[PDB]
Design a protein around this ligand. Structure first.
Ligand SMILES: N[C@@H](Cc1ccc(O)cc1)C(=O)O
Ligand SMILES: N[C@@H](Cc1ccc(O)cc1)C(=O)O
Ligand SMILES: N[C@@H](Cc1ccc(O)cc1)C(=O)O
Ligand SMILES: N[C@@H](Cc1ccc(O)cc1)C(=O)O
Ligand SMILES: N[C@@H](Cc1ccc(O)cc1)C(=O)O
Ligand SMILES: N[C@@H](Cc1ccc(O)cc1)C(=O)O
Ligand SMILES: [Cl-]
Ligand SMILES: [Cl-]
Ligand SMILES: [Cl-]
Ligand SMILES: [Cl-]
Ligand SMILES: [Cl-]
Ligand SMILES: [Cl-]
Ligand SMILES: [Mn+2]
Ligand SMILES: [Mn+2]
Ligand SMILES: [Mn+2]
Ligand SMILES: [Mn+2]
Lengths: 459, 459, 460, 460
């Protein structure tokens, strides 16, 4: 009941000596949150992934870098979203399409609200690993760490760390990515279609009166654009980039490719994605993740939680954006809504005074979690909205650019987060919980967030 | 103190026999409102104008026809405006530019309000003749009939009908038209510049609070368009077409040219303009003006005042749109605001039942005139607005398309019409009256009308 | 000790509608030649996996291809179809895929110039992993290699057994390949001027470069002219390369069936394992399962027609596969041999034109011109390939019909598989780099050279 | 009894700023050759009329031309300038204007192909109504015709008197002409493919058609290639034809001065009677009013350089007229004669390049190659014109500089004015249709033929 892949038996060009040195130095540093599987099996899987067609190509990553530059300069806005954890079982056409649709829907609303371009980065085609605080979960089982490592099912065997999951992760990533590319160059990306869905959502949301005026104004803007002779064909094809947390270093090193351009010197690109981030757990300043990020040419992000200090933030900036390339680095604030107004300003002030131009991105989810009385991990919608609101106050008081958001969402009608216009309750949550990890905003709530964020952008 | 033009001494291709027959039959019919100057002098001036480069060319008139078709079908809107009477003395760069600017300004606002394209036709490059009810004016002088015929100065000599004014009219028309074409392909036509002026007008109008929300929504629509990657270069260059009242038949017949296309049969185009209209005075159903309009291939309009009947309107339609070509004919309603709600519906119903698709255009000026206690002919702004409002009610109750407006305006701060946000009074009017005929809405009032019309279009 | 890694498989979506399943079951109860002999229960489980994976292509790309092929069938565009004889899983790499994509784009710019009309680019890629065989025993005494979707090339009994997990492995490879084709076609790889310069290296370095110089300079001057008029790459619609393979393994194709949205038009059945597929010479029985599977799907399709073809049998393909008279829905692919095309093709084309249907007539030069070398290797002569294309063009010019395209087997590798061409590959040369897992392909130079020769035919 | 009609003239706008007027008065106190001799008070009244008319051109078109000519000066574009020797008011008709516009567009597509770079199209039109003279008495014993802006062509004393109302008549004609040029350049007249087909009629019907066939087919195939790649007319930026004339009559030019908006850049002085102007051979005194008027305006300008030119005098033109080093602000127009260009041009170009400035080097073949026929008429030989262009190109190739353009006198009429060419116009032929009111123009065929020959020079 399985498929069989050969271990090739030459293949990669050898790295120039300095890249090999710097890559080895980076991987020899300590690395948190890594799977515990045998080195020889890891090595065999890396040798397979070293021969595969990449998920992305370097030109796409260079274009993304240029678009991110604009965001860092206060002339575009970044929307990053999708599943908390993608699963092999739900890597289907409807699930992919629903996430693509939700992202495009949010994006048009935010574009209108910001009056500037929106860069769309999905959490997709690789978001298959997660860190854990505890090795042992509530049931006394070894913790689930996403499908790149082990299985979600609640038995011990399924929780064993499996290295064959690295190659399965790629098979799933490459399939999803192929479809995302097909979808972004189809009618799914027509602005006028994508907007139409907003019209359904205003009708069928119980808070629709609340969003009606903005949705009609967007509709009018779109018609106005058409009225001036702009048809879909002339516009740029929609671009949705791929991202995940660079967690599993066995996966990410096997997906490195050596590439030309940008002054003609060889560079390493992680071709498992367009951009990756380093989470709070793995961001050790001398650890392998950060040192790995220094070696790759892709845009990167770092998650900054409530014990971050202005000084450590600056050191992240100096280490990861050493050439001062606007857009190369994104700092992702995840403070909690009760803390973002106090904790973010001095980080922002200090980083701004270095002269570097980073993207300030708000992740209003990770700081605002709690277990419910009914058993399911969950987040209140109002706290999410309030963190983003706080984030915008911080930048407005400083005259800096609130550059983006990073959310966990899905294009399905899941019940995972409390609240919204549907008023999802603790009792409601049990009925439809579909996440393999953290609770995502459903279709309706992610849309509603886009509308509220658009108002924060307009004011 | 004059320039000297030779009478050529061959030049036009001979008309195909049927065009010559139909043209002669049309001109032999009686013609109201014609200048009384000697036939031999008229003939010499026609012979000069028969050799000149035309003001327009047929392809432009074919494109206009296609754009008017859209308006007749309920998918675009027509804005027609400029001077009541152009004068030789004010045919200057600033005056032309101010009228061009005012038209483009109004057009963007109306485009947003209608959510469909707006066709821009200026009263320009030929609007040099007007009909009169009385031969003798208030001062006992022979009436001024526009600079194509005679002079505005209040003495008898200057009021003599002069045929050399036909060639001077063309010299002025061709100059103005050259500049309109230069202007529409310059930065003057950038939408984002043109909109910016709206911002000045909201600030400096005393009713600016009233228009602020719509002006900000338009600004947002424009930014949104830019945010999606639409730059000025991609858009169609702005097109402003030329029109005047086809009054002086000596002028209009001399400006006829024979042309190919549209099924390859020879057609006559009046190359003095893109489209012309027939006013209330000259619209005799068996008169030379209407018969002339039947022979030319240009889009035409007919002014319909308060004694129009549904039956005569149908006969205009059958005579002028005999092939059923949407857009070929525009019926211009000029009823007065107190009468438009009663008089227009049955005309519209009857014409709609013929199957022809005309453009319904409102001229809310000509029905709403009065002499003031202070001496100057004048119009109240509120009555103008109310006629347009009535016009829209009529079409909305019938489900027909309110297709356009036809206004007299200027890009200067004249005091000619009573009212508006500036609250121009009878006492105010004397200080700045600059028209050679009827009172035009000034810059501010024509803008304000565009905003109010945009709201009528949105509701 | 086996140098393999096993990959486990596991929950599905709605089934296809019952009424459509009823039709499909009826068509697929027809006999099917050349099918793998794995067990039914395992094939079923693998099909169940593939019924819910993300598709390789999507319906609106196929509807778009249909519109472009309608243009080819009406005589206003030209079809270029080309790539590996058989893709292998071990060679399904970035460089190999980049090279085939490059080679197709290079051929296309040249044929576009020659033809003065748009060229539709269809690769044999992302699924060309199954082939028929004549003998169930090969020269080494083993059961025959059927393509990676069925068994392995290695000359070992274990590897030659029919393994249905190879259906999923095929999918994984097709989807990765297609992902990369999409990426590359929207990159600078597709820029017209860049791709042409390659053409210029080719003239510089080919030993017959002197004779293609003129057409190459002319192409270059055409490109520089485009650009001098203000045309930048941003002004041109992005490069579209479509995927195709021979629809052979019906467990794979049926599991990749999908129903469209229905928003554009009533929902229709598409094979989303590719954009277009063709039925080969050995599986085109008129009453067989291949031709019937082809009738049921909405994709454009092809049928290979070899020297035994009769004009009446060709007419039956047209009535079965283009019942609604949709231009470009059916391609007839002539593969007759260069010594026979001039005789055998004309009456097929007369009979088919007389039906009123608008098929695309495509030439496959390579298949009918295969032979063995004295040095062992299977091979084809470049001149014979060329001459079949020439003869195909003469038949069409004589008849007043559209020579609509070519279908060729090529790689962007500098392999030594076909004899002849400007490099004058010899029988001794074949052992240098004979890399095909099936028939001899034109190498990178030969495939370009062929494109320059077909451009001259298009101009004539 | 006079067959004329008189047209009366009449209230003005702000004057030009005082500080700018002060500068202009100083420059125009310099002596001015070849000026009309009408009275000052009447000239003044006519200038006052022209100071408030709508301009012929507007500043942003001139700033755009400047950017395109900067590209010519850097070696990435080519200048085509062409039209009537002298426009007449009586021939300023739709057909005559359409014909010159067509001829320029036809030449341009061919030279664009040849050069593989954009061609900037500048017509001599909408103001070419004044010419210098050598003698104040002509062959009929009358004072000389100076162009319609000064006096009339008819051989009568009354008509030859200098009439300043002709300044306004010139304006009226220029503006009408320009209006029509603008209309035509945004019509189907400007569509690349349509204009080329004309080229194809020309090959069919020229008696030397056989020798331009190859380049014409190649151009055609380039166009069909553009279109096969998806380029439609809507994808191309609209045709821009710029207006130029010789700035000769300083009452006209000064009255047409305008100050720009200043929004783009600090407001500058532009002659809005045209987009660009040049100073002729007889009015280019370094300390004269023409060169000084040219220093004060922002338009791009040209200076004609004939056989008496010295490299030092050329350097002074560069320092006076391109003081800020703005590429393409100055064009140097060589008109040396075909027997002299190879000798005389090289040291001028060496000296000017050594200044660091980037001028456009333009060839005027026609002017230096003028002679009288045995049959009376003034005339030029096609071969000599051709050979001067050839010699100009050799000088530049030898020096490594950019042969930047040509400047020619042409019409779209089938006139018989220049000798030679494929029609082999003879001395007897000249009386058939000698229609120029001044020098012999290339007719429609000859001007196209020249374009095909210069394209070959650009390719070489
Ligand atoms: N995959 C190699 C890195 C590498 C990447 C690209 C190369 O071309 C070569 C080596 C590693 O993990 O060590
Ligand atoms: N093409 C190689 C590697 C591969 C593995 C898994 C894939 O999903 C894709 C490619 C194989 O099939 O063995
Ligand atoms: N001007 C002519 C009409 C006409 C127009 C065009 C022609 O080509 C000829 C005649 C008239 O008034 O009678
Ligand atoms: N070109 C003719 C006719 C003409 C008359 C007046 C113009 O405004 C333009 C042209 C002339 O100058 O006599
Ligand atoms: N998501 C399923 C099916 C799948 C199989 C292979 C792929 O290559 C892609 C998807 C799995 O992981 O088993
Ligand atoms: N409007 C002025 C000036 C003018 C003169 C000639 C023209 O050709 C144009 C405008 C006039 O009528 O006298
Ligand atoms: Cl290495
Ligand atoms: Cl790349
Ligand atoms: Cl006639
Ligand atoms: Cl036309
Ligand atoms: Cl689709
Ligand atoms: Cl301007
Ligand atoms: Mn999460
Ligand atoms: Mn009026
Ligand atoms: Mn084969
Ligand atoms: Mn001359």
């Amino acid at each position: 009941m399985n498929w069989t892949v050969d271990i090739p038996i030459p293949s990669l060009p050898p790295l120039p000596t300095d890249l090999r040195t710097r890559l080895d130095a980076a991987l020899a540093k300590p690395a948190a949150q890594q799977p515990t599987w045998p080195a020889d099996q890891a090595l065999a899987m890396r040798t397979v992934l070293e021969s595969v067609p990449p998920v992305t190509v370097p030109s796409e990553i260079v274009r993304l870098q240029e678009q991110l530059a604009q965001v860092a300069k206060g002339e575009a806005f970044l929307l990053q979203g999708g599943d908390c954890a993608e699963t092999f079982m739900d890597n289907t056409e409807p699930h992919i399409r629903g996430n693509v649709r939700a992202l495009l829907q949010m994006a048009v609303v935010l574009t209108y609200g910001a009056s500037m371009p929106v860069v769309k980065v999905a959490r997709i085609a690789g978001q298959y690993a997660k860190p854990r605080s505890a090795d042992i979960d509530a049931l006394g089982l070894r913790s689930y760490r996403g499908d790149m490592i082990n299985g979600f099912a609640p038995d011990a065997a399924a929780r064993e760390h499996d290295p064959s999951r690295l190659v399965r992760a790629y098979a799933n990533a490459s399939a999803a990515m192929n479809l995302v590319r097909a979808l972004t160059s189809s009618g799914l990306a027509s602005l006028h279609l994508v907007h139409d869905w907003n019209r359904e959502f205003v009708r069928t949301s119980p808070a629709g009166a609340r969003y009606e005026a903005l949705a009609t104004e967007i509709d009018r803007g779109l018609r106005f654009m058409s009225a001036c002779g702009v048809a879909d064909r002339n516009l740029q094809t929609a671009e949705i980039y791929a991202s995940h947390e660079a967690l599993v270093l066995d996966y990410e090193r096997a997906m490195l490719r050596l590439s030309d351009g940008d002054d003609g010197e060889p560079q390493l690109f992680d071709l498992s994605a367009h951009t990756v981030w380093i989470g709070e757990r793995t961001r050790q300043i001398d650890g392998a993740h950060i040192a790995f990020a220094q070696v790759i040419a892709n845009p990167v992000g770092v998650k900054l939680g409530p014990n971050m200090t202005p000084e450590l933030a600056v050191e992240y900036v100096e280490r990861l954006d050493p050439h001062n390339k606007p857009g190369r680095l994104t700092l992702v604030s995840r403070m909690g809504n009760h803390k973002v107004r106090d904790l973010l300003p001095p980080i922002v002030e200090k980083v701004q005074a270095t002269g570097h131009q980073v993207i300030w991105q708000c992740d209003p989810m990770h700081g605002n979690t709690h277990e419910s009385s009914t058993g399911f991990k969950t987040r209140h919608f109002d706290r999410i909205v309030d963190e983003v609101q706080g984030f915008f106050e911080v930048h407005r008081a400083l005259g800096t650019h609130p550059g983006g958001i990073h959310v966990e969402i899905t294009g399905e009608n899941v019940t995972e987060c409390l609240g919204g216009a549907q008023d999802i309750s603790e009792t409601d949550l049990a009925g439809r919980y579909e996440t393999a990890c953290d609770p995502r905003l459903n279709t309706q709530q992610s849309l509603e967030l886009a509308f509220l964020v658009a108002e924060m952008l307009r004011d």
